[PDB]
Amino acid sequence: SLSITTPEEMIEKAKGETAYLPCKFTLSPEDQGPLDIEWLISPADNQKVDQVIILYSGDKIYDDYYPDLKGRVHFTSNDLKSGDASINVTNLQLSDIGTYQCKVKKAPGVANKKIHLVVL
Amino acid sequence: SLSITTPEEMIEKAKGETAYLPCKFTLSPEDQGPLDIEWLISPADNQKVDQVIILYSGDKIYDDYYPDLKGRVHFTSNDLKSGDASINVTNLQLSDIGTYQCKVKKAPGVANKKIHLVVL
Amino acid sequence: SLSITTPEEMIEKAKGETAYLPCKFTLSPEDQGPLDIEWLISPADNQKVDQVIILYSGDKIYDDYYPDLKGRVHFTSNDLKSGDASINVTNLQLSDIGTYQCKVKKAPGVANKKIHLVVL
Amino acid sequence: RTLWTTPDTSPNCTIAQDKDSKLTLVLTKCGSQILANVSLIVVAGKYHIINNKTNPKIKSFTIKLLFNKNGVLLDNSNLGKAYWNFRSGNSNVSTAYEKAIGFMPNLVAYPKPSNSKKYARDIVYGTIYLGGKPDQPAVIKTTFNQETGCEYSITFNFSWSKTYENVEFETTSFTFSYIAQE
Amino acid sequence: RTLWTTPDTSPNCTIAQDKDSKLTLVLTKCGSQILANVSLIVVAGKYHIINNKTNPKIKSFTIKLLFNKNGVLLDNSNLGKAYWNFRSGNSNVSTAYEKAIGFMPNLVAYPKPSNSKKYARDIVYGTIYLGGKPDQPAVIKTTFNQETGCEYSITFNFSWSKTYENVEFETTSFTFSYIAQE
Amino acid sequence: RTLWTTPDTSPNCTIAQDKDSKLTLVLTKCGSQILANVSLIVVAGKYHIINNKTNPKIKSFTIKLLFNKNGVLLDNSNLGKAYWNFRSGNSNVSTAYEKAIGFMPNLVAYPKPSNSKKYARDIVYGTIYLGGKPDQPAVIKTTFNQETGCEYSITFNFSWSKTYENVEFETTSFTFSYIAQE
Ligand SMILES: [Ca+2]
Ligand SMILES: [Ca+2]
Ligand SMILES: [Ca+2]
């Protein structure tokens, strides 16, 4: 079935650097629906629901979401549809510490990954 | 299937005259339930739901409905059950302008007709 | 099917005496679930719902219910599971007049009995 | 299977006077629960146009559906029998049904009045809106097996607290469910 | 198919003390949605008769149903296991069920708490009425998969705002649905 | 059978700006009634965080689902087509559906606007709660077959009366039903 490499991952990077957040996925024969990628963050305020960061949907990128990351998050692959939904986050701030989620869908296939990002 | 002749119809008559509102229906073999006839009007106030005018139900006539038409509306046929649900409206007023609906049912058969009445 | 002897019964006893409230039941072959006995009273206040008196459930007796009967109601049988859910009520008061219900369950079997108790 | 009034009934209900209302009721059997959907349009008579300035004491009225042991609707119900039947398309089958026990409210779940008061669980409340207006709430209180002179009953009570002035009594729709007799 | 408490349960729930309440819960499987119907009768103990003049801080209490990976009810649930089963007539089949995964709240729809706060969609609110009285509202808040120490959970929280004086806690019935695990 | 958005959709709805919201909608066919379950999470844009101190006139917004004669969702709907489909597990079948007439709101039950005003019964109201908080009610008003440029429509209007200050618009779930076209 659809799966993602290292579905739980710890990443540490230094303040000011660029974090590479991997989301490399493997499709199965059944996954013949439309590819849909969603990244989310869990806010430091535990009373706030998760927020969307960036999408790949209908072969287009939508990035007008989480204000604190606006302009700093980009898909890294030049061929995302072939299995690479990774993103980077530039000029890391201590406030970027948190859990990031990558959701990869290609109906009926589904998989999710969580990354715990630590900024030093 | 159950149908009504001229299911959308325009009728014009002069003020003070009697309007004949035809609702002649044709039953199909399947229509072996109880005959039910309902006439309604759409009020000039577009914010008001349709109002009942007159009924034929269980072989009886019920006419205690729309006050503006009380006493002025009657079934015309001496044999309504044979296919004639027509009504007349006596002493037409300019306020009688509107859309009238005839609903003919004989379960499982169903049909409706709308008449746009203009009074000159 | 599961049944109870004398499913509607009138009982009269004198003030100060002990009432014996019979609930003798007969199981059917299908009744192989857990035995569950519930007694209830309908309060003299007709606007008040029925109140639990005493239970036999999971081979244990629960009697911390209707305050007016607390300490005065007991199962009488030394072998309730063999068909005897009867209770007594000691030191009868005029206020004990009312309708008492015995519910006997042993899934899928179900039966109920009502007793009209009169205290003289 | 669906037992209903049809979705566009002619007047089929008598509250204050003959055929003064249109009760829309759809019952769909989901095994041991009935999925029910209801609304009311009053077309004539006392409850047609509410004016609590002129009539401050008109605040509540009731519609009863009474059924015999076969689940057949009794003549003295507020709802009429002619167009209460199993569905065919958007209408009904031609022949009056003889059995609908599987659509009846369960008598163990909802016993008739006895020496025991009926528990509140024999009632479902919903809030509907007159004319679809958000500031015109009214309450539909549905009780199972309250009534005498029948084997089963469904009772719909409509009430309101606001002082409505010239508000036509025609409601939004409400869905509920109940435990079936079998 | 129907998984239920039966429609007239003996005390089957423990909130403040053993067997102090009767939870009536009927779950009927409609493919990928469960159609659910619930009410509560408190029969003894702290929540039986509400008096907020004498006890102003009794305003909310919770009942938890905890299930293992097979959809079997865990012993530490507030609801007891003895009469929670697939239906037979107005009672239950004799043998305790081994599998009810098709009745469990879907874990993708309603994930367990994690680094992510649960979305509000994992909750359904209903307003019920104590003693069936229209001026005695209380709120039933049902949450799917909130709880620890289980694979699945349904949590029922009962709360009210009014200052009730000697009001017996026995409720009208509420219907809701939720997405099934399979 | 179930026609849905999936239970954990990526942004699939466009109200004020592209993909600003997640509509969760599950339709399960129970013969002539559709059992429906709905919620909304706004993720970006005008309706994301409500502040009626700064913006006192943001009080209501609408989402439209427009369908053609085959029950296929039209492009100009607020809801997107990509993940609106018949279910497979917790996702959808791979191929876009061609027919879903049995899931459409019945046109005799709920006619399009005409010389006749639509009756209030073509609407269902529910009260949901923002962030799952009992003091944050909002109203979901669902209307069947209100819209032009389609054969069938379902319209969801979200409104509130309270002056909310920095409240994220993400709702509890509401269940309703409606009469199916066939
Ligand atoms: Ca009594
Ligand atoms: Ca968190
Ligand atoms: Ca008009």
UniProtKB/TrEMBL annotation, chains D, E, F:
Residues reported to bind Zn(2+) 2: H48, E168
Residues the entry annotates as binding Zn(2+) 3: H48, E168, E170
Protein residues bound to Zn(2+) 1: C30
Binding-site residues for Ca(2+), renumbered to this chain: E182
Binding site for Mg(2+) 2: D135
Cellular location(s): Host nucleus; Virion
Binding residue positions for Zn(2+) 5: D75
Binding-site residues, Zn(2+) 6: D135
Region forming the signal peptide: none
Family note: Belongs to the adenoviridae fiber family.
Protein name: Fiber
Organism of origin: Human adenovirus D37
Gene: L5
Coverage span on the entire protein: 184 to 365 of 365
